Design an enzyme around this catalytic site. Structure first.
Site, short mmCIF file in Angstrom:
data_model
loop_
_atom_site.label_atom_id
_atom_site.label_comp_id
_atom_site.label_asym_id
_atom_site.label_seq_id
_atom_site.Cartn_x
_atom_site.Cartn_y
_atom_site.Cartn_z
N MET A 1 24.51 -2.51 -22.83
CA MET A 1 23.28 -3.25 -22.44
C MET A 1 22.81 -3.00 -21.20
O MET A 1 23.76 -3.12 -20.15
CB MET A 1 23.69 -4.80 -22.53
N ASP A 2 21.54 -2.72 -21.05
CA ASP A 2 21.21 -2.52 -19.65
C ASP A 2 20.57 -3.74 -19.16
O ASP A 2 21.29 -4.58 -19.35
CB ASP A 2 19.97 -1.58 -19.54
#
Ligand SMILES: CCCCCCCCCCCCCCCCCC(=O)OC[C@H](COP(=O)(O)OCCN)OC(=O)CCCCCCCCCCCCCCCCC
Ligand SMILES: NC(=O)C1=CN([C@@H]2O[C@H](COP(=O)(O)OP(=O)(O)OC[C@H]3O[C@@H](n4cnc5c(N)ncnc54)[C@H](OP(=O)(O)O)[C@@H]3O)[C@@H](O)[C@H]2O)C=CC1
Ligand SMILES: CCCCCCCCCCCC(=O)OC[C@H](COP(=O)(O)OCC[N+](C)(C)C)OC(=O)CCCCCCCCCCC
Ligand SMILES: CCCCCCCCCCCC(=O)OC[C@H](COP(=O)(O)OCC[N+](C)(C)C)OC(=O)CCCCCCCCCCC
Ligand code: SF4
Lengths: 161, 72, 141, 368, 115, 136, 95, 451
Positions: free
Chosen positions: G41-42
């Site tokens: 996940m960014d």
């Protein structure tokens, strides 16, 4: 046709299906009105008017408290009930309206005989006041004492100061 | 950015001029003059001047969600 | 005493109220005879609440603080006291001096409640803000 | 809608006129066209007139109701919308409406009859008269809007007159007349959805069993705009319907949950949501209100049509012939029944039914 | 005087790391109030679509390098948030915000007069 | 004739002078109502801005039928002095239907009364119930 | 009444399902499972997950904790320690 | 400020400080066993709760409920036009006031830059549209100061005469509308007939009852018509009775004083800091008037007194505005008795139009008439901040000249704009009916506020 029976039939229906608090404060008013009218037309017109004078002032104070405490809870909630179970319940209830089981006392009609001895003829409220302020004056003075306690009681409960 | 001050004591008026750009922060005089709160909001609304320290800077004249600064 | 004429009047009053609703209902032109914007149920832009032009939070079921709730509660004890004088009004002559003295005693006990409410200032408005003047002082050195 | 409803800035009408367009397509722009929309004050005319006037097409709106026409003027710029007081029993007024128009749109049509007009007078007599008056005035394009089940040999007096009206329009105006056959149209204040949104619908056990292919009213108004501005659509018949088939019983039950009337197990049955009645009673009540009620109620012919389902004429053209994709009722049903949801009003949390949720609800409705 | 609800004092951030945290905190506030936006403004879309729309606007300014532009973008993003939560925007403005959205060829534009 | 209190700008001053003793609209049965529910006439007296237009439309939509709209002054008619402004609606008839247009900057009290008299003349020509009999 | 009824196994189980509905690299989620490495996940995806995990458990992460969260187990720890049932009306409890 | 564990947007966990001792309880037992032996089943036993709700540190998650928020919106008789006053109430007590303006913002300042100085003058008629001629005067004074010109003697007196007629016109609108909002309907009707008589003087000199582009840079557009002063003097002989009859219903009324005494108190310090001027400043004890501080246009040649309050509330400002009624009437009488002869506009055809008779015979007059109406007049480059004592307060214009015939910048300082920016500070604590009084005592015309 005694139309008061229909009025109480509707009131009992609305008491089973009532959901929010506003409907309850309307069940109260929908109850005092049949009481006031039936007292007016059958037994005591004096107490039909006393009920209206006192209970209405209590009703509005009751209503104004609903405004300050209404808390969103029962507008969006769901009830199930069922139309069939409501009407069946009211039908079974309507079957038995004999509060007394003395059949002769409920069926045989009676009369009273008038006399002319009471030539000093005044209203029931004058006799009630005559006794209340003379013989049962202690009852009146205790009631005054209880009303005083409520005044002090309401202040010591509600007042933050 | 122009500030016109009034002195009721000495019956005198004075002006303060300072400069700014489209991205350069400008100190807020709202802590000093609470009457500058709306004037700074109007200045930002129609020019887009960054008043740093303003307690509540937002549109005051244009429509809600208005794009652009009309007095440029 | 006969109240048959009074019964007919009460009947007329009940019917007369429904006439205003019915007559207005039968007189208004149907919506198709007007601008024809449909039944009132669909026109939600008309049946919405009035907020002077701008919509706001729908706070219908939120509780409303009431600043005079104590006065409203104290209305009930005083209302009962006033209703308690009705027996004396129509029997003032019969009870004589004995009833008059009892009537005063009824009112004198309730006047202590009036003194109590005055001294406690219980019949005021319960504000939630209070404006107090702070003094500016300098801790000099 | 779009920003400019034309493929070019020059359009030569089939009557020989050359019409140039000016502007980028806003309120101040013009397309050079003059159109006459008969029945513009009706449900569909307000959609059609708004789409024509917004792009600068001069619209002549013949009216019989003076109050209903006022809202139409807001659609266009100054001079764009024009009103002519008219009656289908008056010939001079009908010619005055079409005297300058290059496009004539006929939306006049009723499913009822009254003391003054029968279904034959309106669906045939008016359509024939308007088509002939249009031809004598040199109108290049005529557009006539019939119903979805138009058939000259139908048992329904509405379907029959609509079918015959299609024939008479071509026999007067000529082979180039265009015919549109919309399905039941859903929109705000839609006659189709209004009967489903009504609570005290009497005899719904008979009336609501008809199956249809409902179509968005904005697309029908958009399609008519395409037809008038594209001369390749002359002489063609278009069946405008949605991709999915619904029965009014399904939509009636789907709407009930969106309105949340089913939150109480007793209230819908007590409030009259279901009003079953024998068909002879439905016939007598419809027949009686035809000579007692002054407002058009559910009449006898609509009772007959409740059995007839919508049949798509396969030889006609569809939305795909106009280069458009039909909308789905699932993606628009919520927002058009949204005004009727009882409590809503950001009480605790709105139940916004997405397109996926509507289809899930449809299965639950069909589950016994 | 007191500031309105959900008001932040304006400050010029001089640290890119501190600016990044402030942006991420505000982005969370937009997501949390997404269900509130659907309620107040009576939108015809789920809150899930609203959160998607919020992310797109934050993704547009993902690669802005200059710090002075970050502060002005952050300040304007805070003002918009205070506008939406307090219900100052009228419902028509929020409905049109979701109304936003293939280009024609050379000849297609040439025929209609182009742009 | 119950108009709705909708004075926006300097055109409202002349509307207040119609209620003043010199002209005294009340003698003609004209009473200003605060709520749109009790009103049937909407008099737009002042400039309509883009920030105000949705509120004006919502207020108009809440009037029960029959309803009429009077547009008073150059601002409401077509924009007037502020026609080329970024924040002004160029005529109130872009938002609501208008039944009569009263000119002037501002129209005098007599100019507004004349406009009302024109609307009352049109209202007396209504044939709503004969329309049902003869046109429906 | 006004006390939590949460167990570490339920909070983990509900956390995994809410994280499964996202586009994560692996569906095998445990306490040690990191957001950046394991799930991938960014910046924006992580805060979408945090708000999604907020709505599921009716809790609100503080700014300091949310910026510094690394693992799935940290979320489960936070929910268990901070969860409180919402106050009810004066009638729900006593009636 | 910052979302924390115990306080966020949606709820908070409030704990009070513990007044009592932190008593330690260990080894809880019953007569059948220890606490841990039955703690599994103690969730169903209310008598086994170890946490007491009366404890100051008892955890309660309370949803943050919006306080009662009322849109005192544009459609409201109290708001003098278009004001979306947003009030957060506790019952009827005001807790926070958020005046939303711009509903009458029309971009006057932007439009003025596109107009010549003569063309931009009528825009000032429409800012404070009850005190029309005073608005024209402040723009005229600023342009005349930049032009380095001065109005001749008769012109200055005319601007003083209609400066005080306009002031009366404003106070009739302000005092009586404020009284009407409180509930006194009748004084509004009486005094509006006085407005009709005064606007008759407006119409006779200019031809417009309201928007009289009569005060222009260099003097006035046209001279006084024959017989005007006699009508003004005749009106003045009766206007004293009109003021007295108005004071009969308001000044000594106990109901009026209950609505205004102690309502909207403003300290002399807070009046200065928030930029209040005029009656708002003078009601707080500060004796400051612009007609005295920076005199202009024959206000130095007349006599008048300034009323100063001591308690800074609505009743003090009502008395001050009633004194100004009588002080204006005092000035009006003096101007009628002291009006001098001579030109009313500057004797310069590069600024003021020549007479028509001279225009059609003199070539140089025709050139100046042609050039004035097709190019305007150039104003030397510079800037000014010129203030006047407008009836609402201190109205000022900040004009920037670029040497051309159009103003480079024109910022209009509106007295009502500053007054409305102090409403939240003033109206806090007061009830909803008191907000009506505070709005009416500020004399808010929102064209001036928004412009
Ligand atoms: C002048 C006549 C005035 C009354 C006319 C209106 C008739 C409605 C019923 C009047 C009283 C009959 C008994 C009702 C007792 C209160 C129960 C109640 O909740 O009110 C019924 C009303 C109907 O709401 P409904 O949609 O049918 O049910 C809820 C569905 N979820 O739900 C409502 O909340 C609406 C109530 C409106 C306010 C009514 C206040 C009570 C007035 C009573 C005066 C008459 C005394 C009763 C006489 C009849 C006795 C049965
Ligand atoms: N779901 C639907 O709506 C369907 C529509 N259609 C057809 O589409 C067309 C559009 O109808 P729609 O807008 O939806 O609803 P409407 O019922 O309002 O259409 C009727 C229109 O034609 C006018 N009209 C009817 N009779 C007369 C008459 N004697 N004289 C003058 N005008 C008359 C009406 O004028 P006025 O407004 O003044 O009353 C109205 O404008 C209709 O012809 C309809 O048959 C067919 C299938 C589906
Ligand atoms: C005191 C004033 C008395 C006169 C004004 C009222 C007129 C009533 C008759 C009427 O309106 O007649 C017109 C009507 C129908 O036409 P409509 O416009 O839909 O009527 C609306 C009437 N509803 C509301 C019942 C639908 O026809 C008739 O049934 C003729 C009788
Ligand atoms: C109380 C009187 C109300 C009667 C209404 C009425 O008679 O109206 C009903 C009929 C029908 O005519 P319509 O209303 O145009 O039909 C349209 C409405 N439908 C579709 C329901 C039929 O009218 C007539 O027969 C005309 C004579 C009526 C004159 C007035 C009496
Ligand atoms: S038209 Fe003239 S008088 Fe009327 S509001 Fe506009 S500027 Fe004022």
């Amino acid at each position: 046709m005694n139309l008061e029976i229909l009025d109480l039939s509707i009131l009992g229906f609305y008491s089973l299906i009532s959901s929010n608090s506003f409907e309850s404060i309307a069940i109260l008013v929908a109850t005092i009105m049949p009481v006031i009218t039936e007292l007016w037309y059958n037994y005591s017109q004096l107490f039909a008017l006393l009920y209206t004078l006192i209970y209405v002032g209590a009703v509005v104070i009751l209503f104004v408290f609903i405004l300050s405490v209404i808390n969103e809870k029962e507008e969006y909630e769901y009830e199930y009930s069922g139309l069939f179970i409501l009407i069946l319940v009211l039908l079974l209830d309507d079957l038995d309206d004999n509060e007394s089981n003395d059949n002769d006392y409920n069926n045989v009609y009676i009369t009273d005989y008038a006399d002319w001895f009471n030539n000093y003829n005044e209203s029931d409220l004058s006799v009630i006041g005559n006794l209340l302020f003379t013989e049962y004056a202690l009852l009146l003075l205790i009631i005054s004492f209880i009303l005083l306690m409520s005044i002090i009681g309401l202040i010591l409960i509600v007042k933050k100061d | 950015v122009v500030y016109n001050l009034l002195s009721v004591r000495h019956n005198s008026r004075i002006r303060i001029k300072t400069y700014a750009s489209e991205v350069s922060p400008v100190p807020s005089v709202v802590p000093l003059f609470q009457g500058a709160n709306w004037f700074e909001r109007e200045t930002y609304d129609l020019f887009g001047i960054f008043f740093e320290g303003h307690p509540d800077l937002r549109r005051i004249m244009t429509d809600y969600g208005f794009q652009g600064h009309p007095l440029r | 005493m006969l109240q048959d004429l009074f019964n007919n009047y009460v009947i007329l009053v009940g019917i007369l109220g429904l006439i205003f609703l019915g007559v207005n209902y039968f007189i208004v032109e149907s919506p198709r005879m007007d601008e024809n914007n449909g039944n009132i149920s669909d026109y939600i832009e008309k049946s919405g609440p009035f907020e002077c032009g701008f919509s706001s939070f729908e706070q219908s079921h939120n509780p409303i603080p009431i600043a005079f709730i104590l006065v409203a509660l104290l209305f009930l004890p005083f209302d009962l006291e006033v209703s308690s004088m009705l027996p004396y009004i129509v029997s003032i002559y019969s009870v004589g001096i004995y009833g008059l003295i009892i009537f005063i005693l009824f009112l004198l006990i309730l006047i202590v409640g009036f003194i109590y409410e005055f001294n406690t200032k219980s019949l005021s408005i319960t504000t939630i803000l209070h404006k107090k003047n702070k003094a500016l002082v300098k801790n000099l050195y | 809608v779009s920003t400019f409803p034309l493929k070019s800035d020059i359009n030569i009408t089939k009557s020989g006129k050359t019409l140039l367009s000016v502007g980028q397509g806003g309120r101040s722009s013009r397309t050079g066209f003059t159109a006459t929309v008969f029945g513009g004050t009706g449900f569909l005319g307000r959609v059609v007139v708004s789409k024509l006037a917004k792009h600068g097409t001069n619209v002549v709106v013949p009216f019989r109701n003076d109050r209903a026409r006022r809202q139409l003027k807001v659609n266009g710029d100054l001079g764009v919308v024009n009103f002519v007081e008219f009656d289908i029993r008056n010939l001079k007024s009908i010619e005055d409406s079409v005297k300058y128009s290059d496009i004539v749109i006929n939306l006049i049509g009723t499913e009822h009859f009254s003391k003054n007009f029968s279904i034959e007078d309106v669906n045939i007599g008016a359509a024939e008269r308007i088509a002939k008056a249009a031809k004598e005035a040199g109108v290049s394009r005529l557009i006539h809007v019939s119903s979805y089940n138009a058939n000259p040999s139908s048992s329904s007096d509405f379907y029959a007159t609509k079918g015959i009206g299609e024939q008479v329009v071509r026999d007067n105006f000529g082979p180039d007349a265009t015919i549109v056959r919309p399905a039941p149209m859903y929109f705000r204040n839609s006659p189709f959805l209004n009967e489903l949104l009504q609570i005290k619908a009497l005899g719904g056990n008979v009336i609501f069993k008809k199956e249809v292919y409902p179509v968005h009213a904005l697309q029908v108004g958009e399609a008519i705009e395409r037809i008038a501005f594209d001369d390749a659509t002359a002489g063609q018949t278009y069946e405008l319907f949605g991709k999915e088939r619904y029965s009014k019983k399904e939509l009636r039950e789907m709407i009930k949950h969106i309105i949340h009337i089913g939150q109480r197990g007793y209230y819908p049955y007590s409030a009259g949501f279901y009003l079953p009645a024998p068909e002879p009673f439905l016939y007598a009540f419809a027949l009686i209100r035809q000579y007692i009620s002054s407002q058009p109620r559910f009449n006898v012919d609509q009772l007959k049509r409740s059995h007839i389902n919508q049949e798509i004429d396969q030889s006609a053209k569809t939305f795909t012939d106009l280069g458009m994709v039909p909308d789905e009722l699932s993606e628009y049903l919520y927002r058009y029944v949204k005004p009727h949801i009882s409590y809503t009003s950001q009480t605790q949390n709105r139940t916004v039914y997405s397109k996926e949720d509507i289809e899930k609800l449809r299965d639950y409705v069909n589950t016994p | 005087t007191n500031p309105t609800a959900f008001a932040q004092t304006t400050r010029y951030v001089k640290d890119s790391t501190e600016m990044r945290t402030l942006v991420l905190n505000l982005y969370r506030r937009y997501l949390r109030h997404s269900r509130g936006f659907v309620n107040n403004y009576n939108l015809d879309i789920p809150a899930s679509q609203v959160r998607t729309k919020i992310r797109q606007e934050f993704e547009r300014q993902r690669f802005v390098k200059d710090l002075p532009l970050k502060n002005v973008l952050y300040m304007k993003a805070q003002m918009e948030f205070q506008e939406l939560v307090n219900f100052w925007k009228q419902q028509c403005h929020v409905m049109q915000y979701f109304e936003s959205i293939k280009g024609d060829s050379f000849v297609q534009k040439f025929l209609k007069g182009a742009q | 004739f119950w108009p709705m209190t909708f004075g926006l700008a300097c055109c409202a001053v002349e509307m207040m002078h119609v209620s003043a003793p010199r002209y005294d609209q009340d003698r003609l049965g004209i009473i200003f109502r605060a709520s749109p529910r009790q009103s049937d006439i909407m008099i737009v007296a002042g400039t309509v801005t883009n920030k105000m237009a949705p509120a004006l439309r919502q207020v108009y939509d809440q009037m029960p039928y029959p309803r009429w709209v009077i547009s008073m002054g150059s601002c409401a008619n077509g924009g007037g002095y502020y026609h080329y402004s970024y924040s002004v609606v160029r005529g109130v008839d872009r938002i609501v239907p208008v039944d009569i247009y009263v000119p002037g900057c501002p129209p005098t009290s007599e100019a507004l009364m004349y406009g009302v008299f024109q609307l009352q003349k049109k209202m007396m020509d209504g044939q709503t119930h004969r329309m049902w009999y003869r046109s429906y | 009444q006004s006390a939590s009824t949460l167990t570490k196994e339920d909070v983990l189980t509900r956390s995994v399902s809410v994280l499964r509905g996202f586009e994560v690299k692996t569906k095998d989620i445990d306490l040690q499972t990191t957001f950046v490495q394991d799930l991938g996940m960014d910046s924006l995806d992580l805060n979408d997950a945090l708000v999604a995990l907020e709505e599921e458990f009716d809790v609100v992460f503080d700014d300091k904790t949310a910026n510094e969260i690394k693992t799935v187990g940290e979320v489960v720890d936070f929910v268990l320690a901070n969860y409180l049932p919402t106050e009810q009306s004066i009638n729900h409890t006593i009636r | 400020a910052a979302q924390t564990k115990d306080n966020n947007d949606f709820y908070d966990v409030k704990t009070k400080k513990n007044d009592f001792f932190p008593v330690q309880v260990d080894g809880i037992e019953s007569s059948l066993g220890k606490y841990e032996e039955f703690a599994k089943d103690a969730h169903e036993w209310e008598s086994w709760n170890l946490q007491n709700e009366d404890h100051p540190e008892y955890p309660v998650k309370r949803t943050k409920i919006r306080h009662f928020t009322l849109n005192f919106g544009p459609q409201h008789p109290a708001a003098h036009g278009v004001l979306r006053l947003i009030l957060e109430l506790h019952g009827e007590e005001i807790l926070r006031s958020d005046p939303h303006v711009g509903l009458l913002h029309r971009g006057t300042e932007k439009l003025i830059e596109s107009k010549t100085y003569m063309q931009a003058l009528p825009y000032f008629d429409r800012l404070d549209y009850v005190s029309m001629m005073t608005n024209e005067q402040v723009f005229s004074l600023a342009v005349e100061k930049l032009l380095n010109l001065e109005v001749p003697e008769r012109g200055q007196y005319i601007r003083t005469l209609f400066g005080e007629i306009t002031r009366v016109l404003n106070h009739l609108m302000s005092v009586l509308s404020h009284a009407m909002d409180v509930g006194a309907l009748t004084p509004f009707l009486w005094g509006f007939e006085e407005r009709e008589k005064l606007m008759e003087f407006y119409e006779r000199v200019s031809g417009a009852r309201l928007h009289s582009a009569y005060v222009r840079p260099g003097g006035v557009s046209q001279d006084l018509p024959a017989g005007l002063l006699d009508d003004i003097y005749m009106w003045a002989t009766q206007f004293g009775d009109r003021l007295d009859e108005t004071e009969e219903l308001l000044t000594d009324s106990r109901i009026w004083k209950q609505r205004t005494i102690g309502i909207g108190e403003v300290t002399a310090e807070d009046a200065l800091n928030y930029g209040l001027s005029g009656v708002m400043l003078r009601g707080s004890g500060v004796p400051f008037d612009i007609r005295k501080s920076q005199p202009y246009d024959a206000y130095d040649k007349v006599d008048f007194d300034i009323a100063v309050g001591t308690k800074g509330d609505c009743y003090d400002r009502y008395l001050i505005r009633m004194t100004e009624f009588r002080q204006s009437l005092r000035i009006i009488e003096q101007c009628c008795n002291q009006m001098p002869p001579g030109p009313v506009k500057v004797e310069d055809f590069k600024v003021a139009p020549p007479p028509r008779a001279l225009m059609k015979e003199d070539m140089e007059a025709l050139i100046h008439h042609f050039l004035l109406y097709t190019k305007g007049y150039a104003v030397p480059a510079g800037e000014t901040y010129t203030a006047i004592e407008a009836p609402k307060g201190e109205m000022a214009v900040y004009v920037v000249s670029d040497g051309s015939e159009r103003p480079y910048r024109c910022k209009i300082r509106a007295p009502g704009f500053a007054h409305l920016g102090a409403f939240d500070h003033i109206a806090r604590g007061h009830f909803l009916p008191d907000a009506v009084a505070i709005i009416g005592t500020m004399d808010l015309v929102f064209g001036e506020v928004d412009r």
